[PDB]
Design an enzyme around this catalytic site. Structure first.
Site, mmCIF file in Angstrom:
data_model
loop_
_atom_site.group_PDB
_atom_site.id
_atom_site.type_symbol
_atom_site.label_atom_id
_atom_site.label_comp_id
_atom_site.label_asym_id
_atom_site.label_seq_id
_atom_site.Cartn_x
_atom_site.Cartn_y
_atom_site.Cartn_z
ATOM 1 N N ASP B 48 0.709 -1.224 -0.109
ATOM 2 C CA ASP B 48 0.128 -0.158 0.181
ATOM 3 C C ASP B 48 0.870 1.251 0.081
ATOM 4 O O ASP B 48 2.052 1.418 0.439
ATOM 5 C CB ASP B 48 -0.887 0.014 1.366
ATOM 6 N N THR B 81 -5.212 7.197 -3.126
ATOM 7 C CA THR B 81 -4.308 8.304 -2.640
ATOM 8 C C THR B 81 -2.866 8.105 -3.069
ATOM 9 O O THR B 81 -1.982 8.646 -2.571
ATOM 10 C CB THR B 81 -4.060 7.793 -1.077
ATOM 11 N N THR B 82 -2.603 7.537 -4.110
ATOM 12 C CA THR B 82 -1.456 7.461 -4.671
ATOM 13 C C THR B 82 -1.466 7.902 -6.455
ATOM 14 O O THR B 82 -0.128 8.145 -6.942
ATOM 15 C CB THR B 82 -0.953 5.761 -5.005
ATOM 16 N N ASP B 382 -14.615 -0.234 4.413
ATOM 17 C CA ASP B 382 -14.538 0.240 3.047
ATOM 18 C C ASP B 382 -16.000 0.190 2.383
ATOM 19 O O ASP B 382 -16.331 1.351 1.607
ATOM 20 C CB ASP B 382 -13.844 -0.833 1.995
HETATM 21 N N1 LIG Z 1 -11.212 -4.407 -11.829
HETATM 22 C C1 LIG Z 1 -10.165 -3.341 -12.355
HETATM 23 N N2 LIG Z 1 -10.109 -3.387 -13.894
HETATM 24 C C2 LIG Z 1 -9.417 -2.481 -14.376
HETATM 25 N N3 LIG Z 1 -8.792 -1.654 -13.600
HETATM 26 C C3 LIG Z 1 -8.776 -1.612 -12.164
HETATM 27 C C4 LIG Z 1 -9.641 -2.481 -11.623
HETATM 28 N N4 LIG Z 1 -9.379 -2.232 -10.057
HETATM 29 C C5 LIG Z 1 -8.452 -1.284 -10.231
HETATM 30 N N5 LIG Z 1 -8.161 -0.928 -11.262
HETATM 31 C C6 LIG Z 1 -7.131 0.322 -11.462
HETATM 32 O O1 LIG Z 1 -6.373 0.400 -10.218
HETATM 33 C C7 LIG Z 1 -5.947 1.671 -10.045
HETATM 34 C C8 LIG Z 1 -6.062 1.723 -8.382
HETATM 35 O O2 LIG Z 1 -4.700 0.835 -7.781
HETATM 36 P P1 LIG Z 1 -4.418 0.911 -6.462
HETATM 37 O O3 LIG Z 1 -3.613 2.029 -6.140
HETATM 38 O O4 LIG Z 1 -3.970 -0.458 -6.147
HETATM 39 O O5 LIG Z 1 -5.840 1.150 -5.524
HETATM 40 P P2 LIG Z 1 -6.044 2.652 -4.824
HETATM 41 O O6 LIG Z 1 -5.934 3.473 -5.582
HETATM 42 O O7 LIG Z 1 -7.355 2.375 -4.163
HETATM 43 O O8 LIG Z 1 -5.131 2.450 -3.683
HETATM 44 C C9 LIG Z 1 -7.072 2.423 -10.480
HETATM 45 O O9 LIG Z 1 -6.740 3.574 -10.965
HETATM 46 C C10 LIG Z 1 -8.010 1.623 -11.518
HETATM 47 O O10 LIG Z 1 -7.962 1.971 -12.554
#
Ligand SMILES: Nc1ncnc2c1ncn2[C@@H]1O[C@H](COP(=O)(O)OP(=O)(O)O)[C@@H](O)[C@H]1O
Lengths: 56, 514
Positions: B48, B81-82, B382
């Site tokens: 994360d 948040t990234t 969540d």
């Molecule tokens: N089922 C999915 N299909 C396609 N893209 C996805 C899917 N789930 C997440 N993503 C992509 O992953 C990105 C976020 O990844 P991550 O950084 O691991 O989660 P978060 O942003 O919640 O921390 C998003 O921009 C999204 O486009």
């Protein structure tokens, strides 16, 4: 494709000659080998998934 | 002069770029892991971005500003948040080449603000609104936005808790939500996790006593906050102890001293007393507990400050202190108490709280081996977070890289249409929007440039076509995959990134210190 029980010769411990491990061999549990292979694959995947080790 | 502010800006940009590049291979479900090493030699594997951002430490104004921005983004929205760090890094990389030519920061800031406003208006005009006045459409939206956060079995396991938590229909579709104002999800060890149900009133887990019958209805709470500790002596032994004399004195001080206070306190109705945590008391006199066993005994310990704040808010009372108090503002509500176990170990009492002005209801969850309780807690967290995010607005859109390419093309056509020297700066924004799809294509395992070009061609031809798939590993339409996201997680993120960029660009000159 002739048979599946025979023609399964292996190695020998007395000398370097192929011997049939069916009429006098020792069988081993397959679940143990399956679990060992699964654990080895999991360890390899876990090690390959590790990227960097720098204090981030 | 000019060399010192230029060098300061260059150093700040380099530090921000290094901070942004320290973590980048973690966006998406197929991200890489990182082993952070502690100062003592311990290693911890994590993936994360928030954990890595909050664990590392570095002294720098730009790094502290980025950390504060990430914290504000995580507090406000709660998801993604990234990507804000990558957006800020791309904007700073564009501003670097913009300032290398010779442009004033005011025009660049105005162009960035105009581009942000245009992108926000395009995102608001492109998204489609839904409805939520009834329960069928709300449940459909919940079950459509909940089947895309974790794996299939975890989703099927958290679906009962999700549909139990979403049933809390208190606000009649207002502007804001109060899901973080009156919610106190407790945790209990022992039993089966299937025995879960919404509980009002108050839930405790400390044994009252161990005497005869303790099934009464006297407010069920002792509103007392004065000191109950024993008077400490000035030293170990004030005199020489051996025979009597000194033994009778300490015996009377231990038996005929605090008993007078207990008698003068118990003269008032509702004989219900308690105490906070036993973090400062060495040992409590058991003689007082034996003397209090008669005429009804009720005492509950192990109480924190958050529990006091929850009790004083759910019932609707205010605690009192001091000894000289001859008022009558310490009663509560009497209904039902004295609960037993639910076929298992672990003591836990519940009160439904009938006829109370505060309708606060919580969820009492359980578990086993401390493995499925924290997971369910994070799942319901969540769940209610995304529920509040969806109820805050009504707009929604799908992710994958299509909105980014659409916004980039719109900004390009706007910079081509709009006249003025600032348009070039707007073009910089057109080069600071195709980073997420390229990163996703690189992490998936395909050609990023070819995929980006194909997506741009499809967007220029058939407007809304498809995006980037992860499970199949190709280019498929998003309408078949059950995955969506609210519009706030993008609008708020873009506004915060633009504000942070403007703040880091307006700050220059020299950095004097003490
Ligand atoms: N089922 C999915 N299909 C396609 N893209 C996805 C899917 N789930 C997440 N993503 C992509 O992953 C990105 C976020 O990844 P991550 O950084 O691991 O989660 P978060 O942003 O919640 O921390 C998003 O921009 C999204 O486009």
């Amino acid at each position: 494709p002739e048979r599946k029980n025979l023609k399964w010769i292996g190695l020998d411990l007395s000398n370097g000659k192929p011997r049939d491990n069916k009429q006098a061999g020792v069988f081993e549990p397959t679940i143990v080998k399956v679990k060992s292979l699964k654990f080895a694959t999991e360890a390899a995947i876990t090690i390959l998934r590790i990227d960097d080790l720098i204090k981030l | 002069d000019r060399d010192k502010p230029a060098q300061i800006r260059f150093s700040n940009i380099s530090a921000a770029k290094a901070v942004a590049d320290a973590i980048r291979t973690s966006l998406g479900p197929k991200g890489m892991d990182k082993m952070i090493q502690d100062g003592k030699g311990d290693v911890t594997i994590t993936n994360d971005g928030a954990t890595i951002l909050k664990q590392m430490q570095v002294l720098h104004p730009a790094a502290r500003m980025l950390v504060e921005l990430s914290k504000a983004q995580d507090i406000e929205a709660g998801d993604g948040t990234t990507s804000v760090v990558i957006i800020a890094g791309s904007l700073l990389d564009s501003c670097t080449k913009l300032l290398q030519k010779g442009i004033h920061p005011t025009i660049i800031s105005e162009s960035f603000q105009k581009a942000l406003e245009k992108g926000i208006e395009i995102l608001t005009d492109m998204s489609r609104p839904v409805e939520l006045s009834d329960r069928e459409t709300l449940l459909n939206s919940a079950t459509t936005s909940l089947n895309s956060k974790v794996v299939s079995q975890y989703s099927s396991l958290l679906s009962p808790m999700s549909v139990n938590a979403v049933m809390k229909v208190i606000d009649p579709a207002t502007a804001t939500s109060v899901d973080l104002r009156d919610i106190k999800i407790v945790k209990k060890l022992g039993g089966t996790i299937d025995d879960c149900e919404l509980v009002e009133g108050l839930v405790l887990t400390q044994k009252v006593s161990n005497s005869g019958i303790t099934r009464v209805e006297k407010a069920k709470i002792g509103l007392i906050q004065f000191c109950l500790s024993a008077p400490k002596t000035d030293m170990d032994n004030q005199i020489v102890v051996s025979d009597y004399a000194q033994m009778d004195r300490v015996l009377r001080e231990e038996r005929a001293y605090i008993l007078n206070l207990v008698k003068q306190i118990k003269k008032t109705g509702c004989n219900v007393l308690l105490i906070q945590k036993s973090i400062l008391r060495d040992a409590l006199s058991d003689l007082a507990l034996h003397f209090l066993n008669k005429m009804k005994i009720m005492v509950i310990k192990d109480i924190e400050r958050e529990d006091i704040e929850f009790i004083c808010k759910t019932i609707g009372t205010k605690p009192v202190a001091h000894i000289d108090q001859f008022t009558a503002d310490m009663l509560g509500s009497a209904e039902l108490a004295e609960e037993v176990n639910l076929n298992g170990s672990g003591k836990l009492l519940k009160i439904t709280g009938c006829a109370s002005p505060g309708k606060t209801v919580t969820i009492v969850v359980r578990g086993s081996n401390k493995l499925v309780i924290e997971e369910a807690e994070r799942s319901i967290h969540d769940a209610l977070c995304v529920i509040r995010c969806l109820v805050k607005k009504r707009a929604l859109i799908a992710g994958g890289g299509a909105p980014e390419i659409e916004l980039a093309l719109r900004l390009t056509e706007y910079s081509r249409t709009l006249s003025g020297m600032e348009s070039y700066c707007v073009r910089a924004f057109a080069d600071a929007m195709e980073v997420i799809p390229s990163t996703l294509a690189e992490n998936a395992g395909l050609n990023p440039i070819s995929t980006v070009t194909e997506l741009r061609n499809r967007h220029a031809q058939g407007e809304k076509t498809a995006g980037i798939n992860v499970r199949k590993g190709g280019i498929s339409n998003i309408l078949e995959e059950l995955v969506v996201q609210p519009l706030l997680v993008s609008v708020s993120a873009l506004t915060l990134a633009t504000e942070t960029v403007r703040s880091i660009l307006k700050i220059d000159d020299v950095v004097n210190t003490r």
